[PDB]
Symmetry: D2
Subunit: 45 residues, 4 copies
């Protein structure tokens, strides 16, 4: 949830890819619950 | 520029992992770029 | 189940990123399960058993 | 090329997800490149 964990990565290219996915997953907590629904009602539209 | 594309997936479990990643990547566009920079600066 | 499903994606950049992740996840099925288990055991050991210590269920 | 880097992750769920992706990317080296081409050709056959 808030646990600080370290992921060992081999190479800059893999690191940059995992960093972009890590960021998107962590940034979801900075989104309002209304945005997360607005988008989800737009997905089935 | 955001077109609608369909990704064929083999397996339920792979589909679920990909769905969670797709949502988080697409939802980033609904964040102000200032919030993304505020977060990135806080990470370093 | 290993069924054919279609994931709708908005944007080329997200699609290409998902395409690369899908390929590596699907390509793992082309490896013997014994290779995957061995690789995972070798990963557990390294970095003062970091991946072992960071395992949630024990 | 394959420099050891540590990615700090906040949250168990994000960590487990990234760990599974990292593993799949690293395990691809254990595949013969003929298998990767066979798979890619088979993917554009059902497209």
């Amino acid at each position: 949830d808030d646990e600080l964990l370290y992921l060992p990565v081999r190479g800059r290219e893999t690191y940059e890819m995992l960093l972009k996915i890590k960021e998107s997953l962590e940034l979801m907590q900075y989104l309002p619950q209304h945005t997360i629904e607005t988008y989800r009602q737009q997905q089935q539209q």
